[PDB]
Amino acid sequence: SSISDLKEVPRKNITLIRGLGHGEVYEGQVSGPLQVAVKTLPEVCSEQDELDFLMEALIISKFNHQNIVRCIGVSLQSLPRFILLELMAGGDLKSFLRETRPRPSLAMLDLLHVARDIACGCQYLEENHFIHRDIAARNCLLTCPGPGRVAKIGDFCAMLPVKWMPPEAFMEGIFTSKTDTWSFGVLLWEIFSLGYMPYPSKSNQEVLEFVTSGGRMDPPKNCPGPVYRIMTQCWQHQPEDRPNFAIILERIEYCTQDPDVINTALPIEYGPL
Numbered sequence: 001s002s003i004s005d006l007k008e009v010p011r012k013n014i015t016l017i018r019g020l021g022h023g024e025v026y027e028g029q030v031s032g033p034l035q036v037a038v039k040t041l042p043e044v045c046s047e048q049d050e051l052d053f054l055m056e057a058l059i060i061s062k063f064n065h066q067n068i069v070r071c072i073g074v075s076l077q078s079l080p081r082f083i084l085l086e087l088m089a090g091g092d093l094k095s096f097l098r099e100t101r102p103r104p105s106l107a108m109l110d111l112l113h114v115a116r117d118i119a120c121g122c123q124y125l126e127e128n129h130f131i132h133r134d135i136a137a138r139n140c141l142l143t144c145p146g147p148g149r150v151a152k153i154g155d156f157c158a159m160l161p162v163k164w165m166p167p168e169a170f171m172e173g174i175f176t177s178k179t180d181t182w183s184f185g186v187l188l189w190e191i192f193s194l195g196y197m198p199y200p201s202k203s204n205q206e207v208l209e210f211v212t213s214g215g216r217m218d219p220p221k222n223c224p225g226p227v228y229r230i231m232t233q234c235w236q237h238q239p240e241d242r243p244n245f246a247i248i249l250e251r252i253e254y255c256t257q258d259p260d261v262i263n264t265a266l267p268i269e270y271g272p273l
């Protein structure tokens with residue numbers, strides 16, 4: 001991947017409309033009128049921050065897949081520097097699951113399609129030997145809120161997302177393609193719980209101890225068995241025993257053909273608790 005590959009958009013053509021993410025993220029506009037999301041590099045930054053920014057642009061730009069957020073161009077010759085991505089109007093998946101919970105909206109088939117979309121994106125990353133390292137609902141994005149939505153993969157010690165990591169990751173600092181399989185399991189759980197925090201009432205240390213000694217989340221409310229089985233297969237203790245993403249995709253697709261899965265009602269939350 002050469003800088004030659006990055007499409008430089010002259011700064012005059014770029015307009016920031018509103019902020020999106022608390023570098024920073026904005027919705028913007030490119031005139032030749034194109035709708036984009038913009039990632040900025042802070043003007044005050046390291047020499048290594050500059051390398052990272054370039055590197056992210058280089059890596060995102062070489063990916064060509066329907067379920068990975070596309071880099072549409074860059075603006076690196078003006079300050080502050082921009083990486084331009086396709087605007088995903090539906091927002092992040094976690095917010096979406098939370099805002100669209102049924103009240104007295106979403107069916108199983110809708111959740112399964114998001115799951116398939118992300119599994120399909122993860123398979124492509126595995127095929128190109130890229131380790132994401134933070135597959136999670138907060139990092140997935142939707143093209144729109146409606147029935148035709150497509151989910152895509154993005155990316156925005158007591159810092160590590162322990163609740164999404166396999167034991168060898170947080171104990172041993174080992175990352176491989178089977179890392180993202182574990183994280184995908186936890187994502188599945190986030191999807192089928194309709195956006196709850198994993199390990200509901202546990203702290204990071206409690207999760208570490210719980211998971212290192214064989215503990216696993218219970219299925220989300222009304223979660224069908226075959227979907228839970230995919231989760232528990234993603235959470236096999238040893239990396240070798242976890243399925244790759246071709247197998248996961250196949251299993252999600254078979255779930256999607258099972259009437260007993262797709263006819264299952266989602267739980268409805270009673271406001272007064």
Ligand SMILES: COc1cc2nccc(Oc3ccc4oc(Nc5ccc(Cl)cc5)nc4c3)c2cc1OC
Pocket residue numbers: 020021025037038039056060068069085086087088089090091092132141153154155156
């Ligand atoms: C409508 O709201 C949003 C739309 C968005 N549309 C496109 C992109 C958004 O956020 C980002 C911002 C920066 C990003 O950098 C990356 N990089 C990336 C993408 C894929 C892979 Cl596999 C690795 C890195 N994804 C990003 C996603 C968006 C964020 C939004 O709200 C926070």
